[PDB]
Amino acid sequence: ESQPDPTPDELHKSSEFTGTMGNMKYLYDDHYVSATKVMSVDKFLAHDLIYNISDKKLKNYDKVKTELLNEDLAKKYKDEVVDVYGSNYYVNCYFSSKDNVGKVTGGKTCMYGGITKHEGNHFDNGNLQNVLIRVYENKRNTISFEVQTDKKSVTAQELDIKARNFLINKKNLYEFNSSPYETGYIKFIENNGNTFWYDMMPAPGDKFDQSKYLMMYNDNKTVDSKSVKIEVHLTTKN
Ligand SMILES: [Zn+2]
């Protein structure tokens, strides 16, 4: 059911990552795909969905492929009108898409999960929900800040992205060469008592695989924005 807290020895240490921390920072520093009321237009593999989504800013892509945990999830959202929000990558992003006139199999950008039904998923009076993030540095709550979302059921991915974007800016969570923190995990606590956490640091070694890291979001896990509680736990060292 609930996921047990990290054992001391299982959390990734920034000390053991000899690659460039900027590759991790890239995924969260004002970086995300956002789309409203779209419907998939194609598939590549059985568990993914392809959408016609182009970025106004920079014009880096016109097609987005999102991979889900399995075929049932893909099937569930295939013909649904959804909203999209997630962290995209280009390295090792593959797909032969159903490209309209202007393009030919436009394999532009990739991501995982990040899908929520549009209909009935928004607050009345067009209000935004504020979600509080409490951050602990070396076991002490140093700061707390709020992120906002207009979705009632929001992906954990969306809140994680917003939380890290703020921390990168205010706490230098990730820098180009390294990070001022040794370990770090973001923990979600749901209203029914269920808990889960994501390790915020890259796996040991000299290489960082963006697609491998973001794959954790393929479960398309959603939480109730009005009741979730989020805690960021960081230890200093680096
Ligand atoms: Zn919507």
From Swiss-Prot:
Kindly list the places in or outside the cell where this protein is found, as annotated in its UniProt entry.
Answer: Secreted
Q: Which cofactor(s) are needed, names only?
A: Zn(2+)
* SS bond partners: 93-110
Cite the binding residues for Zn(2+) 2.
47, 71, 80, 119
The record's cofactor note says: Possesses two zinc-binding sites. The zinc ion is necessary for the toxin interaction with MHC class II.
Outcome of substituting residue 47 to A = About 30% loss of T-cell stimulation
In alphabetical order, the GO MF annotations are: metal ion binding; toxin activity
**Superkingdom in the source lineage:** Bacteria
This protein's UniProt keywords = Disulfide bond, Enterotoxin, Metal-binding, Secreted, Signal, Superantigen, Toxin, Virulence, Zinc
Asked whether the keyword Membrane is assigned, the reply is no
Task: Locate the residues binding Zn(2+) 1.
Answer: 9, 83, 118, 122
**A single Gene Ontology CC term:** extracellular region
Question: What family is reported?
Answer: Belongs to the staphylococcal/streptococcal toxin family.
The record's subunit annotation is: Interacts with host MHC class II molecules composed of alpha/HLA-DRA and beta/HLA-DRB1 chains.
What is this protein's function? Staphylococcal enterotoxin that activates the host immune system by binding as unprocessed molecules to major histocompatibility (MHC) complex class II and T-cell receptor (TCR) molecules. In turn, this ternary complex activates a large number of T-lymphocytes initiating a systemic release of pro-inflammatory cytokines. Also causes the intoxication staphylococcal food poisoning syndrome.
Q: What's this protein's name?
A: Enterotoxin type C-2
Q: Which organism is it from?
A: Staphylococcus aureus
